[PDB]
Amino acid sequence: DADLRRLSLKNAKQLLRKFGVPEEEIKKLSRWEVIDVVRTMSTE
DNA sequence: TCTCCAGCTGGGGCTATTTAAACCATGCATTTTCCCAGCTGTGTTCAGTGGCGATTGGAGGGTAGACCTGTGGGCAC
C-alpha cells in the first residue's frame, strides 16, 4: 500500500492503462480512488 | 652745408642632425569592482499513510416458552 503513494498519480494512471482498467476510472484520476483501484487490480 | 631719404651692401635668424631631461594631450585598453541573475539548498507546509481506536454488524450460545407425548388416575360398563 505504501509504494502505491510513491506511484505519484501519473505513473499510477499509466499502470491502470497497462492493466486494462476502463478509461472512466483513469479519467477520474483520483489520487486515492486510483490507488485503491490499482491495489484491487493487483489483488485480482 | 646740413638734413633727409632711400636703396643697398654686406650682416644676423630661419632651415638640418644627434642626444638626454621632464611634460602633455586624447581617446584607448585593461583591470577591478559592483550589481544583477541564476542555481542550489534548506525549511516549512501539506497531505499521504500508517496506525490505532471506535462503532456497527453478524454469528453463536443460552434461556424461555410452547407443544407433543406419556403416564396415571378416575370413572363407567
Tab-separated table of N, CA, C and O (backbone and C1' of nucleotides) in Angstrom, chain B:
chain	number	residue	atom	x	y	z
B	1	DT	P	80.937	123.367	-46.884
B	1	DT	O5'	79.532	123.320	-46.135
B	1	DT	C5'	79.080	124.432	-45.340
B	1	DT	C4'	77.723	124.133	-44.749
B	1	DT	C3'	77.610	122.770	-44.065
B	1	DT	O3'	76.713	122.852	-42.953
B	1	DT	C1'	76.071	122.870	-45.838
B	2	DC	P	77.023	122.034	-41.616
B	2	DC	O5'	75.590	121.889	-40.939
B	2	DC	C5'	74.504	122.731	-41.359
B	2	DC	C4'	73.316	121.888	-41.762
B	2	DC	C3'	73.213	120.522	-41.079
B	2	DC	O3'	71.814	120.300	-40.909
B	2	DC	C1'	73.073	120.246	-43.383
B	3	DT	P	71.272	119.557	-39.595
B	3	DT	O5'	69.881	118.954	-40.082
B	3	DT	C5'	69.047	119.697	-40.986
B	3	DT	C4'	68.365	118.770	-41.963
B	3	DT	C3'	68.006	117.384	-41.415
B	3	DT	O3'	66.748	117.039	-41.997
B	3	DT	C1'	69.224	117.148	-43.387
B	4	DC	P	65.705	116.056	-41.243
B	4	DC	O5'	64.765	115.511	-42.407
B	4	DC	C5'	64.793	116.133	-43.707
B	4	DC	C4'	64.996	115.102	-44.791
B	4	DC	C3'	64.497	113.695	-44.449
B	4	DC	O3'	63.980	113.123	-45.652
B	4	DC	C1'	66.693	113.569	-45.148
B	5	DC	P	62.792	112.059	-45.602
B	5	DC	O5'	62.534	111.760	-47.144
B	5	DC	C5'	63.489	112.178	-48.138
B	5	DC	C4'	64.234	110.987	-48.687
B	5	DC	C3'	63.599	109.630	-48.370
B	5	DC	O3'	63.886	108.739	-49.449
B	5	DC	C1'	65.791	109.615	-47.657
B	6	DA	P	62.718	108.187	-50.379
B	6	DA	O5'	63.483	107.849	-51.737
B	6	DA	C5'	64.900	108.088	-51.864
B	6	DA	C4'	65.669	106.797	-51.730
B	6	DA	C3'	64.803	105.537	-51.639
B	6	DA	O3'	65.464	104.479	-52.335
B	6	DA	C1'	66.255	105.595	-49.836
B	7	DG	P	64.619	103.286	-52.977
B	7	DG	O5'	65.655	102.615	-53.982
B	7	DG	C5'	66.777	103.361	-54.489
B	7	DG	C4'	68.071	102.801	-53.946
B	7	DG	C3'	68.213	101.284	-54.051
B	7	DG	O3'	69.607	100.997	-54.169
B	7	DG	C1'	68.408	101.897	-51.824
B	8	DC	P	70.116	99.728	-54.986
B	8	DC	O5'	71.695	99.809	-54.802
B	8	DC	C5'	72.263	100.605	-53.742
B	8	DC	C4'	72.880	99.713	-52.691
B	8	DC	C3'	72.838	98.218	-53.013
B	8	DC	O3'	74.009	97.596	-52.484
B	8	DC	C1'	71.857	98.575	-50.943
B	9	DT	P	75.134	97.028	-53.465
B	9	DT	O5'	76.463	97.723	-52.925
B	9	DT	C5'	76.423	98.661	-51.832
B	9	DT	C4'	76.828	97.988	-50.543
B	9	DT	C3'	77.464	96.606	-50.703
B	9	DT	O3'	78.537	96.533	-49.766
B	9	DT	C1'	75.673	96.469	-49.204
B	10	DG	P	79.931	95.862	-50.167
B	10	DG	O5'	79.630	94.298	-50.068
B	10	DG	C5'	80.178	93.484	-48.974
B	10	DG	C4'	79.587	93.928	-47.656
B	10	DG	C3'	79.729	92.985	-46.457
B	10	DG	O3'	80.025	93.767	-45.291
B	10	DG	C1'	77.429	93.416	-46.863
B	11	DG	P	80.406	93.061	-43.904
B	11	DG	O5'	78.995	92.896	-43.186
B	11	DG	C5'	78.801	91.954	-42.117
B	11	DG	C4'	77.510	92.241	-41.392
B	11	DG	C3'	77.137	91.230	-40.307
B	11	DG	O3'	76.435	91.860	-39.229
B	11	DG	C1'	75.488	91.199	-41.999
B	12	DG	P	76.341	91.141	-37.803
B	12	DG	O5'	74.813	90.703	-37.709
B	12	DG	C5'	74.361	89.823	-36.652
B	12	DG	C4'	72.888	89.516	-36.786
B	12	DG	C3'	72.462	88.202	-36.123
B	12	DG	O3'	71.145	88.223	-35.569
B	12	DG	C1'	72.030	88.093	-38.452
B	13	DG	P	70.645	86.970	-34.649
B	13	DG	O5'	69.471	86.320	-35.508
B	13	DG	C5'	68.148	86.888	-35.494
B	13	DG	C4'	67.199	86.023	-36.292
B	13	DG	C3'	67.017	84.604	-35.751
B	13	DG	O3'	65.648	84.203	-35.907
B	13	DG	C1'	67.838	84.497	-37.958
B	14	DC	P	65.177	82.730	-35.483
B	14	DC	O5'	65.339	81.903	-36.834
B	14	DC	C5'	64.798	80.574	-36.972
B	14	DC	C4'	64.089	80.409	-38.298
B	14	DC	C3'	64.147	78.994	-38.875
B	14	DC	O3'	62.941	78.286	-38.573
B	14	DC	C1'	65.074	80.514	-40.433
B	15	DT	P	63.027	76.792	-37.985
B	15	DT	O5'	63.782	75.992	-39.138
B	15	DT	C5'	63.037	75.302	-40.157
B	15	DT	C4'	63.909	75.000	-41.355
B	15	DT	C3'	64.809	73.781	-41.218
B	15	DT	O3'	64.100	72.576	-41.524
B	15	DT	C1'	66.056	75.586	-42.103
B	16	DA	P	64.737	71.162	-41.204
B	16	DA	O5'	65.715	70.982	-42.440
B	16	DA	C5'	66.053	69.683	-42.890
B	16	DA	C4'	67.330	69.231	-42.229
B	16	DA	C3'	67.196	68.439	-40.922
B	16	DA	O3'	67.183	67.021	-41.214
B	16	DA	C1'	69.032	70.038	-40.958
B	17	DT	P	66.482	65.991	-40.204
B	17	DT	O5'	67.706	65.442	-39.344
B	17	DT	C5'	68.968	65.128	-39.969
B	17	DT	C4'	70.043	64.952	-38.923
B	17	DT	C3'	69.536	64.580	-37.532
B	17	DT	O3'	69.476	63.157	-37.418
B	17	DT	C1'	71.363	66.171	-37.453
B	18	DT	P	68.413	62.468	-36.436
B	18	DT	O5'	69.302	62.056	-35.180
B	18	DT	C5'	70.616	61.495	-35.361
B	18	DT	C4'	71.489	61.810	-34.168
B	18	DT	C3'	70.782	61.736	-32.820
B	18	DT	O3'	70.947	60.410	-32.314
B	18	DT	C1'	72.174	63.705	-32.968
B	19	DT	P	69.783	59.733	-31.445
B	19	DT	O5'	69.990	60.376	-30.002
B	19	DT	C5'	71.096	59.975	-29.173
B	19	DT	C4'	71.317	60.968	-28.055
B	19	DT	C3'	70.123	61.202	-27.139
B	19	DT	O3'	70.172	60.253	-26.074
B	19	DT	C1'	71.265	63.262	-27.635
B	20	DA	P	68.925	59.285	-25.812
B	20	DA	O5'	68.449	59.706	-24.353
B	20	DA	C5'	69.349	59.598	-23.238
B	20	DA	C4'	69.442	60.915	-22.504
B	20	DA	C3'	68.169	61.353	-21.793
B	20	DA	O3'	68.183	60.767	-20.490
B	20	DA	C1'	69.299	63.212	-22.847
B	21	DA	P	66.835	60.604	-19.635
B	21	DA	O5'	66.522	62.098	-19.150
B	21	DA	C5'	67.101	62.519	-17.936
B	21	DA	C4'	66.673	63.896	-17.719
B	21	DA	C3'	65.163	63.876	-17.622
B	21	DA	O3'	64.806	63.917	-16.231
B	21	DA	C1'	65.968	65.516	-19.184
B	22	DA	P	63.446	63.194	-15.755
B	22	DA	O5'	62.621	64.366	-15.056
B	22	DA	C5'	62.911	65.754	-15.313
B	22	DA	C4'	61.642	66.515	-15.618
B	22	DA	C3'	60.341	65.747	-15.379
B	22	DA	O3'	59.331	66.697	-15.012
B	22	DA	C1'	60.516	66.258	-17.663
B	23	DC	P	57.795	66.254	-14.845
B	23	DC	O5'	57.134	66.724	-16.217
B	23	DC	C5'	57.365	68.056	-16.721
B	23	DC	C4'	56.392	68.388	-17.827
B	23	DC	C3'	55.026	67.706	-17.728
B	23	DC	O3'	54.014	68.653	-18.085
B	23	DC	C1'	55.985	67.240	-19.825
B	24	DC	P	52.504	68.443	-17.598
B	24	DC	O5'	51.701	68.332	-18.971
B	24	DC	C5'	51.857	69.330	-19.998
B	24	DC	C4'	50.976	68.998	-21.179
B	24	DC	C3'	49.760	68.133	-20.839
B	24	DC	O3'	48.660	68.459	-21.696
B	24	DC	C1'	51.118	66.978	-22.361
B	25	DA	P	47.156	68.358	-21.150
B	25	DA	O5'	46.287	68.795	-22.410
B	25	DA	C5'	46.920	69.243	-23.625
B	25	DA	C4'	46.665	68.261	-24.742
B	25	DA	C3'	45.326	67.524	-24.660
B	25	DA	O3'	44.764	67.387	-25.969
B	25	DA	C1'	47.077	65.956	-24.732
B	26	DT	P	43.206	67.668	-26.208
B	26	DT	O5'	42.708	66.342	-26.938
B	26	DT	C5'	43.642	65.444	-27.566
B	26	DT	C4'	42.970	64.134	-27.909
B	26	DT	C3'	41.613	63.914	-27.249
B	26	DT	O3'	40.820	63.049	-28.070
B	26	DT	C1'	43.145	62.325	-26.415
B	27	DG	P	39.227	63.172	-28.061
B	27	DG	O5'	38.764	61.797	-27.402
B	27	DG	C5'	38.235	60.730	-28.213
B	27	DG	C4'	39.309	59.716	-28.528
B	27	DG	C3'	38.900	58.261	-28.293
B	27	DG	O3'	39.529	57.401	-29.249
B	27	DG	C1'	40.744	58.770	-26.933
B	28	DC	P	39.115	55.855	-29.341
B	28	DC	O5'	40.235	55.127	-28.474
B	28	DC	C5'	41.546	54.888	-29.020
B	28	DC	C4'	42.313	53.908	-28.161
B	28	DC	C3'	41.560	52.628	-27.794
B	28	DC	O3'	42.493	51.542	-27.778
B	28	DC	C1'	42.275	53.695	-25.837
B	29	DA	P	42.029	50.038	-28.161
B	29	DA	O5'	42.825	49.106	-27.132
B	29	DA	C5'	44.071	49.538	-26.601
B	29	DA	C4'	44.254	49.032	-25.182
B	29	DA	C3'	43.448	47.787	-24.829
B	29	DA	O3'	44.145	47.044	-23.842
B	29	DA	C1'	42.829	49.480	-23.403
B	30	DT	P	44.016	45.447	-23.781
B	30	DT	O5'	44.694	45.100	-22.382
B	30	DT	C5'	45.454	46.100	-21.680
B	30	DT	C4'	44.973	46.223	-20.254
B	30	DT	C3'	44.291	44.976	-19.683
B	30	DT	O3'	44.670	44.880	-18.310
B	30	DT	C1'	42.907	46.819	-19.378
B	31	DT	P	44.946	43.450	-17.619
B	31	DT	O5'	45.030	43.766	-16.062
B	31	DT	C5'	45.241	45.115	-15.611
B	31	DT	C4'	44.162	45.516	-14.631
B	31	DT	C3'	43.527	44.368	-13.839
B	31	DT	O3'	43.268	44.916	-12.549
B	31	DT	C1'	41.857	45.653	-14.815
B	32	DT	P	43.401	44.001	-11.238
B	32	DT	O5'	42.446	44.738	-10.198
B	32	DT	C5'	42.302	46.168	-10.235
B	32	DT	C4'	40.880	46.566	-9.912
B	32	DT	C3'	40.134	45.624	-8.963
B	32	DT	O3'	39.310	46.440	-8.129
B	32	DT	C1'	38.872	45.936	-10.898
B	33	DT	P	38.973	46.018	-6.605
B	33	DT	O5'	37.726	46.924	-6.210
B	33	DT	C5'	37.366	48.057	-7.024
B	33	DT	C4'	35.899	48.005	-7.382
B	33	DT	C3'	35.013	47.230	-6.403
B	33	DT	O3'	33.770	47.927	-6.320
B	33	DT	C1'	34.666	46.429	-8.560
B	34	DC	P	32.984	48.065	-4.918
B	34	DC	O5'	31.539	48.592	-5.321
B	34	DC	C5'	31.327	49.210	-6.600
B	34	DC	C4'	30.202	48.520	-7.336
B	34	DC	C3'	29.123	47.881	-6.453
B	34	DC	O3'	27.901	48.123	-7.146
B	34	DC	C1'	29.870	46.331	-8.021
B	35	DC	P	26.539	48.368	-6.335
B	35	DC	O5'	25.424	47.919	-7.379
B	35	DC	C5'	25.653	48.067	-8.792
B	35	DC	C4'	25.048	46.910	-9.550
B	35	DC	C3'	23.818	46.273	-8.898
B	35	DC	O3'	22.926	45.895	-9.949
B	35	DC	C1'	25.407	44.621	-9.327
B	36	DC	P	21.326	46.037	-9.780
B	36	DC	O5'	20.721	45.161	-10.962
B	36	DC	C5'	21.533	44.829	-12.098
B	36	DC	C4'	21.540	43.336	-12.323
B	36	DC	C3'	20.272	42.592	-11.888
B	36	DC	O3'	20.059	41.633	-12.919
B	36	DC	C1'	22.157	41.514	-11.034
B	37	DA	P	18.583	41.137	-13.342
B	37	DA	O5'	18.849	39.672	-13.927
B	37	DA	C5'	20.111	39.356	-14.502
B	37	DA	C4'	20.468	37.902	-14.252
B	37	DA	C3'	19.282	36.981	-13.991
B	37	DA	O3'	19.602	35.672	-14.436
B	37	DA	C1'	20.669	36.914	-12.160
B	38	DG	P	18.485	34.757	-15.125
B	38	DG	O5'	19.220	33.353	-14.903
B	38	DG	C5'	20.641	33.297	-14.844
B	38	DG	C4'	21.095	32.205	-13.893
B	38	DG	C3'	20.087	31.087	-13.659
B	38	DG	O3'	20.780	29.886	-13.367
B	38	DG	C1'	20.549	32.079	-11.637
B	39	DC	P	20.232	28.488	-13.928
B	39	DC	O5'	21.148	27.423	-13.181
B	39	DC	C5'	22.385	27.835	-12.577
B	39	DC	C4'	22.433	27.405	-11.130
B	39	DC	C3'	21.601	26.168	-10.781
B	39	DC	O3'	22.351	25.496	-9.771
B	39	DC	C1'	21.049	27.899	-9.333
B	40	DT	P	22.458	23.896	-9.796
B	40	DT	O5'	22.814	23.544	-8.285
B	40	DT	C5'	23.690	24.399	-7.536
B	40	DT	C4'	23.193	24.552	-6.119
B	40	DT	C3'	22.504	23.323	-5.517
B	40	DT	O3'	22.958	23.290	-4.167
B	40	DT	C1'	21.170	25.209	-5.200
B	41	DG	P	23.160	21.908	-3.358
B	41	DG	O5'	22.927	22.342	-1.833
B	41	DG	C5'	23.195	23.678	-1.430
B	41	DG	C4'	22.238	24.112	-0.335
B	41	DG	C3'	21.622	22.977	0.473
B	41	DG	O3'	21.339	23.436	1.785
B	41	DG	C1'	19.922	24.161	-0.523
B	42	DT	P	21.567	22.458	3.036
B	42	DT	O5'	20.864	23.244	4.228
B	42	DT	C5'	20.625	24.654	4.114
B	42	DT	C4'	19.172	24.966	4.383
B	42	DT	C3'	18.452	24.013	5.344
B	42	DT	O3'	17.642	24.874	6.140
B	42	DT	C1'	17.170	24.321	3.422
B	43	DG	P	17.283	24.542	7.677
B	43	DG	O5'	15.885	25.288	7.890
B	43	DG	C5'	15.567	26.433	7.109
B	43	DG	C4'	14.076	26.501	6.834
B	43	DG	C3'	13.200	25.757	7.834
B	43	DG	O3'	11.934	26.394	7.913
B	43	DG	C1'	12.837	24.864	5.745
B	44	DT	P	11.115	26.401	9.291
B	44	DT	O5'	9.677	26.910	8.835
B	44	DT	C5'	9.506	27.536	7.551
B	44	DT	C4'	8.370	26.885	6.795
B	44	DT	C3'	7.293	26.230	7.665
B	44	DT	O3'	6.043	26.485	7.025
B	44	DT	C1'	8.033	24.710	6.068
B	45	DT	P	4.684	26.669	7.878
B	45	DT	O5'	3.519	26.496	6.806
B	45	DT	C5'	3.813	26.571	5.400
B	45	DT	C4'	3.237	25.376	4.676
B	45	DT	C3'	2.021	24.730	5.344
B	45	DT	O3'	1.131	24.339	4.297
B	45	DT	C1'	3.625	23.099	4.904
B	46	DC	P	-0.481	24.346	4.471
B	46	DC	O5'	-0.956	23.625	3.133
B	46	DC	C5'	0.021	23.217	2.153
B	46	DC	C4'	0.029	21.714	1.993
B	46	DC	C3'	-1.238	20.996	2.468
B	46	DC	O3'	-1.572	19.992	1.508
B	46	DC	C1'	0.639	19.964	3.382
B	47	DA	P	-3.097	19.596	1.242
B	47	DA	O5'	-2.962	18.332	0.283
B	47	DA	C5'	-1.664	17.883	-0.151
B	47	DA	C4'	-1.315	16.560	0.491
B	47	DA	C3'	-2.508	15.648	0.792
B	47	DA	O3'	-2.243	14.333	0.304
B	47	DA	C1'	-1.103	15.812	2.672
B	48	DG	P	-3.445	13.371	-0.123
B	48	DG	O5'	-2.680	12.150	-0.797
B	48	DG	C5'	-1.246	12.162	-0.886
B	48	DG	C4'	-0.655	11.069	-0.027
B	48	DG	C3'	-1.603	9.923	0.341
B	48	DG	O3'	-0.973	8.670	0.010
B	48	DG	C1'	-0.484	10.709	2.255
B	49	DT	P	-1.718	7.180	0.132
B	49	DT	O5'	-0.920	6.375	1.250
B	49	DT	C5'	0.371	6.843	1.684
B	49	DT	C4'	0.702	6.358	3.074
B	49	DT	C3'	-0.117	5.161	3.558
B	49	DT	O3'	0.708	4.393	4.438
B	49	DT	C1'	-0.408	6.933	5.040
B	50	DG	P	0.493	2.818	4.595
B	50	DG	O5'	1.550	2.445	5.724
B	50	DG	C5'	2.398	3.469	6.274
B	50	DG	C4'	2.174	3.602	7.764
B	50	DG	C3'	1.524	2.395	8.444
B	50	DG	O3'	2.248	2.193	9.659
B	50	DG	C1'	0.319	4.343	8.976
B	51	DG	P	2.176	0.804	10.450
B	51	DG	O5'	1.960	1.293	11.949
B	51	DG	C5'	1.796	2.697	12.226
B	51	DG	C4'	0.634	2.914	13.164
B	51	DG	C3'	-0.055	1.636	13.641
B	51	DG	O3'	-0.525	1.953	14.950
B	51	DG	C1'	-1.645	3.075	12.822
B	52	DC	P	-0.461	0.896	16.190
B	52	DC	O5'	-1.276	1.587	17.369
B	52	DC	C5'	-1.498	3.005	17.351
B	52	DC	C4'	-2.970	3.309	17.495
B	52	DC	C3'	-3.786	2.282	18.290
B	52	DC	O3'	-4.686	3.077	19.060
B	52	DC	C1'	-4.853	2.741	16.269
B	53	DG	P	-5.209	2.615	20.515
B	53	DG	O5'	-6.621	3.360	20.646
B	53	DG	C5'	-6.847	4.574	19.942
B	53	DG	C4'	-8.300	4.686	19.516
B	53	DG	C3'	-9.281	3.867	20.346
B	53	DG	O3'	-10.544	4.513	20.349
B	53	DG	C1'	-9.421	3.170	18.160
B	54	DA	P	-11.454	4.510	21.665
B	54	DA	O5'	-12.841	4.857	20.948
B	54	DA	C5'	-12.847	5.625	19.750
B	54	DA	C4'	-13.980	5.192	18.837
B	54	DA	C3'	-15.151	4.512	19.540
B	54	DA	O3'	-16.343	4.763	18.810
B	54	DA	C1'	-14.279	3.048	17.995
B	55	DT	P	-17.721	5.001	19.596
B	55	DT	O5'	-18.797	5.010	18.422
B	55	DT	C5'	-18.379	5.184	17.060
B	55	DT	C4'	-18.898	4.055	16.202
B	55	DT	C3'	-20.187	3.389	16.690
B	55	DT	O3'	-20.899	3.062	15.498
B	55	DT	C1'	-18.588	1.761	16.273
B	56	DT	P	-22.491	3.273	15.441
B	56	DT	O5'	-22.937	2.261	14.297
B	56	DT	C5'	-22.115	2.086	13.134
B	56	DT	C4'	-22.064	0.630	12.738
B	56	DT	C3'	-23.353	-0.168	12.960
B	56	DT	O3'	-23.458	-1.002	11.808
B	56	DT	C1'	-21.539	-1.325	13.862
B	57	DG	P	-24.881	-1.440	11.190
B	57	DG	O5'	-24.561	-2.851	10.506
B	57	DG	C5'	-23.245	-3.133	10.044
B	57	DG	C4'	-22.924	-4.608	10.199
B	57	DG	C3'	-24.135	-5.531	10.247
B	57	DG	O3'	-23.775	-6.800	9.726
B	57	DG	C1'	-22.950	-5.781	12.203
B	58	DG	P	-24.813	-7.638	8.843
B	58	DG	O5'	-24.114	-9.066	9.013
B	58	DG	C5'	-22.708	-9.145	9.220
B	58	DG	C4'	-22.362	-10.321	10.113
B	58	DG	C3'	-23.394	-11.444	10.137
B	58	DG	O3'	-22.738	-12.678	10.393
B	58	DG	C1'	-23.145	-10.640	12.276
B	59	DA	P	-23.224	-14.016	9.667
B	59	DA	O5'	-22.548	-15.049	10.687
B	59	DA	C5'	-21.365	-14.680	11.386
B	59	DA	C4'	-21.335	-15.314	12.765
B	59	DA	C3'	-22.179	-16.573	12.916
B	59	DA	O3'	-21.598	-17.409	13.902
B	59	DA	C1'	-22.942	-15.004	14.414
B	60	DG	P	-21.613	-18.999	13.726
B	60	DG	O5'	-21.352	-19.371	15.261
B	60	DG	C5'	-20.619	-18.479	16.091
B	60	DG	C4'	-21.131	-18.528	17.520
B	60	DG	C3'	-21.848	-19.815	17.904
B	60	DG	O3'	-21.676	-20.051	19.293
B	60	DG	C1'	-23.309	-18.061	18.181
B	61	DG	P	-21.480	-21.538	19.845
B	61	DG	O5'	-21.873	-21.240	21.365
B	61	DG	C5'	-21.643	-19.948	21.916
B	61	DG	C4'	-22.711	-19.600	22.935
B	61	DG	C3'	-23.413	-20.794	23.569
B	61	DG	O3'	-23.832	-20.448	24.880
B	61	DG	C1'	-24.991	-19.503	22.508
B	62	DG	P	-23.767	-21.522	26.063
B	62	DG	O5'	-24.798	-20.797	27.047
B	62	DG	C5'	-24.936	-19.383	27.011
B	62	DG	C4'	-26.364	-18.971	27.323
B	62	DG	C3'	-27.167	-19.987	28.126
B	62	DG	O3'	-28.135	-19.305	28.908
B	62	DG	C1'	-28.243	-19.633	26.125
B	63	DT	P	-28.468	-19.822	30.390
B	63	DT	O5'	-29.770	-18.989	30.770
B	63	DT	C5'	-30.080	-17.781	30.056
B	63	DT	C4'	-31.490	-17.836	29.519
B	63	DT	C3'	-32.483	-18.676	30.332
B	63	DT	O3'	-33.681	-17.907	30.310
B	63	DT	C1'	-32.621	-19.250	28.077
B	64	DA	P	-34.736	-17.919	31.529
B	64	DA	O5'	-36.125	-17.571	30.813
B	64	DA	C5'	-36.128	-16.806	29.614
B	64	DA	C4'	-37.264	-17.237	28.701
B	64	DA	C3'	-38.433	-17.918	29.405
B	64	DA	O3'	-39.626	-17.667	28.676
B	64	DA	C1'	-37.562	-19.381	27.860
B	65	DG	P	-41.006	-17.422	29.444
B	65	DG	O5'	-41.976	-17.735	28.212
B	65	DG	C5'	-41.531	-17.494	26.882
B	65	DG	C4'	-42.125	-18.508	25.922
B	65	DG	C3'	-43.420	-19.161	26.389
B	65	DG	O3'	-44.203	-19.513	25.259
B	65	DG	C1'	-41.853	-20.811	26.067
B	66	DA	P	-45.796	-19.368	25.299
B	66	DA	O5'	-46.113	-20.353	24.078
B	66	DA	C5'	-45.165	-20.510	23.029
B	66	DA	C4'	-45.200	-21.925	22.477
B	66	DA	C3'	-46.511	-22.670	22.696
B	66	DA	O3'	-46.701	-23.602	21.645
B	66	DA	C1'	-44.825	-23.856	23.713
B	67	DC	P	-48.171	-23.846	21.051
B	67	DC	O5'	-47.967	-25.116	20.115
B	67	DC	C5'	-46.650	-25.478	19.673
B	67	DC	C4'	-46.355	-26.919	20.016
B	67	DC	C3'	-47.573	-27.847	20.078
B	67	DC	O3'	-47.117	-29.079	19.526
B	67	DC	C1'	-46.307	-28.089	22.014
B	68	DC	P	-48.079	-29.929	18.565
B	68	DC	O5'	-47.474	-31.397	18.671
B	68	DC	C5'	-46.057	-31.586	18.813
B	68	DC	C4'	-45.768	-32.698	19.794
B	68	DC	C3'	-46.806	-33.821	19.843
B	68	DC	O3'	-46.061	-35.008	20.112
B	68	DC	C1'	-46.457	-33.003	21.991
B	69	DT	P	-46.434	-36.370	19.353
B	69	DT	O5'	-45.872	-37.488	20.334
B	69	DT	C5'	-44.631	-37.273	21.027
B	69	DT	C4'	-44.721	-37.788	22.445
B	69	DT	C3'	-45.585	-39.039	22.645
B	69	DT	O3'	-44.861	-39.816	23.595
B	69	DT	C1'	-46.193	-37.405	24.192
B	70	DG	P	-44.894	-41.431	23.593
B	70	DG	O5'	-44.633	-41.801	25.128
B	70	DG	C5'	-43.899	-40.909	25.958
B	70	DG	C4'	-44.411	-40.958	27.386
B	70	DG	C3'	-45.128	-42.247	27.772
B	70	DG	O3'	-44.957	-42.482	29.158
B	70	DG	C1'	-46.590	-40.491	28.047
B	71	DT	P	-44.775	-43.982	29.697
B	71	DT	O5'	-44.911	-43.806	31.272
B	71	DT	C5'	-44.767	-42.504	31.862
B	71	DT	C4'	-45.962	-42.182	32.725
B	71	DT	C3'	-46.675	-43.382	33.355
B	71	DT	O3'	-46.969	-42.940	34.678
B	71	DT	C1'	-48.235	-41.968	32.355
B	72	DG	P	-47.048	-43.952	35.931
B	72	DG	O5'	-48.079	-43.226	36.915
B	72	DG	C5'	-48.219	-41.811	36.876
B	72	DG	C4'	-49.646	-41.400	37.189
B	72	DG	C3'	-50.450	-42.413	37.994
B	72	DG	O3'	-51.417	-41.733	38.775
B	72	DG	C1'	-51.523	-42.061	35.993
B	73	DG	P	-51.775	-42.241	40.247
B	73	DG	O5'	-53.186	-41.497	40.377
B	73	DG	C5'	-53.413	-40.283	39.674
B	73	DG	C4'	-54.864	-40.169	39.248
B	73	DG	C3'	-55.847	-40.988	40.078
B	73	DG	O3'	-57.111	-40.344	40.080
B	73	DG	C1'	-55.985	-41.688	37.892
B	74	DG	P	-58.125	-40.421	41.344
B	74	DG	O5'	-59.393	-39.618	40.809
B	74	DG	C5'	-59.349	-38.966	39.525
B	74	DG	C4'	-60.436	-39.484	38.611
B	74	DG	C3'	-61.608	-40.188	39.303
B	74	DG	O3'	-62.802	-39.870	38.582
B	74	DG	C1'	-60.759	-41.570	37.655
B	75	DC	P	-64.236	-39.917	39.300
B	75	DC	O5'	-65.246	-39.892	38.067
B	75	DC	C5'	-64.754	-39.757	36.719
B	75	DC	C4'	-65.217	-40.909	35.853
B	75	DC	C3'	-66.521	-41.590	36.286
B	75	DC	O3'	-67.273	-41.915	35.112
B	75	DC	C1'	-64.862	-43.195	36.018
B	76	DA	P	-68.875	-41.882	35.132
B	76	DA	O5'	-69.262	-42.530	33.729
B	76	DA	C5'	-68.237	-42.900	32.788
B	76	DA	C4'	-68.434	-44.309	32.274
B	76	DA	C3'	-69.775	-44.970	32.586
B	76	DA	O3'	-69.979	-45.965	31.573
B	76	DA	C1'	-68.077	-46.252	33.527
B	77	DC	P	-71.454	-46.277	30.916
B	77	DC	O5'	-71.255	-47.561	29.997
B	77	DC	C5'	-69.939	-47.926	29.554
B	77	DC	C4'	-69.645	-49.364	29.912
B	77	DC	C3'	-70.859	-50.295	29.972
B	77	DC	O3'	-70.396	-51.510	29.389
B	77	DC	C1'	-69.579	-50.540	31.906
